[PDB]
Design a protein around this ligand. Structure first.
Ligand SMILES: [Cl-]
Ligand SMILES: [Cl-]
Length: 162
Protein backbone atom coordinates (compact mmCIF):
# COMPACT_ATOMS: atom_id res chain seq x y z
CA UNK A 1 0.00 0.00 0.00
CA UNK A 2 1.36 3.58 -0.31
CA UNK A 3 0.27 7.07 0.17
CA UNK A 4 -1.28 7.40 -3.23
CA UNK A 5 -3.43 4.35 -2.84
CA UNK A 6 -4.22 5.41 0.68
CA UNK A 7 -5.50 8.81 -0.28
CA UNK A 8 -7.18 7.46 -3.34
CA UNK A 9 -9.19 5.38 -0.88
CA UNK A 10 -9.94 8.31 1.62
CA UNK A 11 -10.79 10.82 -1.15
CA UNK A 12 -12.36 8.77 -3.93
CA UNK A 13 -12.38 9.88 -7.61
CA UNK A 14 -14.85 12.31 -9.22
CA UNK A 15 -14.58 13.83 -12.64
CA UNK A 16 -17.21 16.43 -12.23
CA UNK A 17 -17.12 19.36 -9.74
CA UNK A 18 -18.76 18.32 -6.51
CA UNK A 19 -19.27 19.52 -2.94
CA UNK A 20 -17.04 17.93 -0.34
CA UNK A 21 -18.22 17.04 3.18
CA UNK A 22 -17.69 20.69 4.41
CA UNK A 23 -19.61 21.68 1.34
CA UNK A 24 -16.74 23.10 -0.74
CA UNK A 25 -16.16 22.80 -4.41
CA UNK A 26 -13.75 20.07 -5.20
CA UNK A 27 -12.82 17.72 -8.07
CA UNK A 28 -10.72 14.66 -8.82
CA UNK A 29 -9.03 13.06 -5.97
CA UNK A 30 -9.90 15.41 -3.26
CA UNK A 31 -8.64 18.48 -5.08
CA UNK A 32 -10.17 21.50 -3.31
CA UNK A 33 -11.05 24.15 -5.76
CA UNK A 34 -12.29 26.88 -3.68
CA UNK A 35 -13.87 27.62 -0.39
CA UNK A 36 -16.18 30.04 -2.16
CA UNK A 37 -19.87 29.34 -2.49
CA UNK A 38 -19.84 30.32 -6.26
CA UNK A 39 -19.88 27.69 -8.90
CA UNK A 40 -18.42 30.00 -11.42
CA UNK A 41 -15.70 30.84 -9.14
CA UNK A 42 -15.07 27.13 -8.85
CA UNK A 43 -15.27 26.75 -12.59
CA UNK A 44 -12.71 29.44 -13.10
CA UNK A 45 -10.32 28.04 -10.62
CA UNK A 46 -10.64 24.69 -12.40
CA UNK A 47 -9.94 26.11 -15.84
CA UNK A 48 -6.95 27.81 -14.43
CA UNK A 49 -5.68 24.69 -12.71
CA UNK A 50 -6.11 22.55 -15.74
CA UNK A 51 -5.19 25.09 -18.28
CA UNK A 52 -8.25 24.80 -20.43
CA UNK A 53 -11.91 25.60 -20.73
CA UNK A 54 -13.39 22.67 -18.81
CA UNK A 55 -16.96 23.42 -18.15
CA UNK A 56 -16.54 21.52 -14.77
CA UNK A 57 -15.53 18.19 -16.17
CA UNK A 58 -12.11 16.64 -16.40
CA UNK A 59 -10.56 13.55 -17.43
CA UNK A 60 -8.89 10.87 -15.40
CA UNK A 61 -5.51 11.82 -16.61
CA UNK A 62 -6.23 15.32 -15.52
CA UNK A 63 -7.46 14.19 -12.13
CA UNK A 64 -4.30 12.19 -11.67
CA UNK A 65 -2.09 15.04 -12.64
CA UNK A 66 -3.59 17.31 -9.99
CA UNK A 67 -3.27 14.46 -7.45
CA UNK A 68 0.40 14.09 -8.24
CA UNK A 69 0.90 17.78 -7.76
CA UNK A 70 -1.09 17.84 -4.49
CA UNK A 71 0.74 14.97 -2.92
CA UNK A 72 3.97 16.63 -3.92
CA UNK A 73 3.03 20.01 -2.47
CA UNK A 74 2.05 18.22 0.79
CA UNK A 75 5.40 16.38 1.23
CA UNK A 76 7.23 19.59 0.44
CA UNK A 77 5.03 21.55 2.66
CA UNK A 78 5.72 19.35 5.63
CA UNK A 79 9.40 19.42 4.90
CA UNK A 80 9.41 23.06 4.75
CA UNK A 81 7.39 23.51 8.06
CA UNK A 82 9.36 24.05 11.30
CA UNK A 83 6.81 22.26 13.33
CA UNK A 84 6.09 19.34 11.02
CA UNK A 85 9.51 18.57 9.83
CA UNK A 86 10.95 17.26 13.04
CA UNK A 87 7.95 15.08 13.48
CA UNK A 88 8.04 13.63 10.06
CA UNK A 89 11.79 13.08 10.40
CA UNK A 90 11.14 11.04 13.48
CA UNK A 91 8.70 8.67 12.02
CA UNK A 92 8.83 5.40 10.30
CA UNK A 93 7.54 4.92 6.74
CA UNK A 94 3.93 4.02 7.36
CA UNK A 95 3.30 6.65 9.85
CA UNK A 96 4.92 9.29 7.61
CA UNK A 97 2.15 8.53 5.06
CA UNK A 98 -0.37 9.08 7.76
CA UNK A 99 0.99 12.53 8.41
CA UNK A 100 0.94 13.30 4.69
CA UNK A 101 -2.71 12.30 4.61
CA UNK A 102 -3.64 14.83 7.21
CA UNK A 103 -1.64 17.71 5.64
CA UNK A 104 -3.19 16.82 2.25
CA UNK A 105 -6.56 17.16 3.77
CA UNK A 106 -6.10 20.04 6.05
CA UNK A 107 -3.10 21.92 5.15
CA UNK A 108 0.11 22.50 7.01
CA UNK A 109 -1.36 25.14 9.09
CA UNK A 110 -4.16 22.91 10.09
CA UNK A 111 -1.97 20.10 11.08
CA UNK A 112 0.72 22.22 12.68
CA UNK A 113 -2.08 23.18 15.13
CA UNK A 114 -2.28 19.69 16.66
CA UNK A 115 0.49 20.69 18.93
CA UNK A 116 -0.06 18.16 21.53
CA UNK A 117 -0.67 15.17 19.38
CA UNK A 118 2.38 16.08 17.40
CA UNK A 119 4.59 16.00 20.47
CA UNK A 120 3.17 12.68 21.42
CA UNK A 121 3.97 11.35 17.97
CA UNK A 122 7.52 12.62 18.26
CA UNK A 123 7.80 10.82 21.57
CA UNK A 124 6.40 7.57 20.12
CA UNK A 125 3.48 7.41 22.60
CA UNK A 126 1.11 5.88 20.01
CA UNK A 127 -1.91 5.10 22.15
CA UNK A 128 -1.69 8.55 23.79
CA UNK A 129 -1.43 10.43 20.52
CA UNK A 130 -4.37 8.42 19.16
CA UNK A 131 -6.64 9.47 21.98
CA UNK A 132 -5.54 13.07 21.62
CA UNK A 133 -6.07 13.10 17.85
CA UNK A 134 -9.76 11.98 18.36
CA UNK A 135 -10.52 15.02 20.47
CA UNK A 136 -10.92 17.24 17.50
CA UNK A 137 -13.40 18.69 15.07
CA UNK A 138 -11.61 16.75 12.40
CA UNK A 139 -12.37 13.47 14.08
CA UNK A 140 -15.93 14.54 14.95
CA UNK A 141 -16.97 15.51 11.42
CA UNK A 142 -15.26 12.60 9.65
CA UNK A 143 -15.19 9.74 12.01
CA UNK A 144 -14.51 6.97 9.52
CA UNK A 145 -11.61 8.61 7.77
CA UNK A 146 -10.10 10.00 10.98
CA UNK A 147 -10.28 6.49 12.46
CA UNK A 148 -8.25 5.03 9.60
CA UNK A 149 -5.64 7.71 9.88
CA UNK A 150 -5.49 7.39 13.59
CA UNK A 151 -5.20 3.60 13.51
CA UNK A 152 -2.29 3.94 11.16
CA UNK A 153 -0.50 6.22 13.63
CA UNK A 154 -1.32 3.83 16.41
CA UNK A 155 -0.24 0.67 14.65
CA UNK A 156 2.45 1.69 12.19
CA UNK A 157 0.67 -0.78 9.86
CA UNK A 158 -1.89 -0.48 6.92
CA UNK A 159 -4.54 -2.69 8.50
CA UNK A 160 -7.18 0.08 8.52
CA UNK A 161 -6.89 0.16 4.84
CA UNK A 162 -6.48 -3.53 4.05
CL1 LIG B 1 -3.30 23.93 -8.95
CL1 LIG C 1 -17.36 9.31 8.69
Amino acid sequence: MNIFEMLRIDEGLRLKIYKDHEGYYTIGIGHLLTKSPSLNAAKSELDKAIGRNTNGVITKDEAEKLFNQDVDAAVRGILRNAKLKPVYDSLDAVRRAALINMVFQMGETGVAGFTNSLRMLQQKRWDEAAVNLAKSRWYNQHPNRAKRVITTFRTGTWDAYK
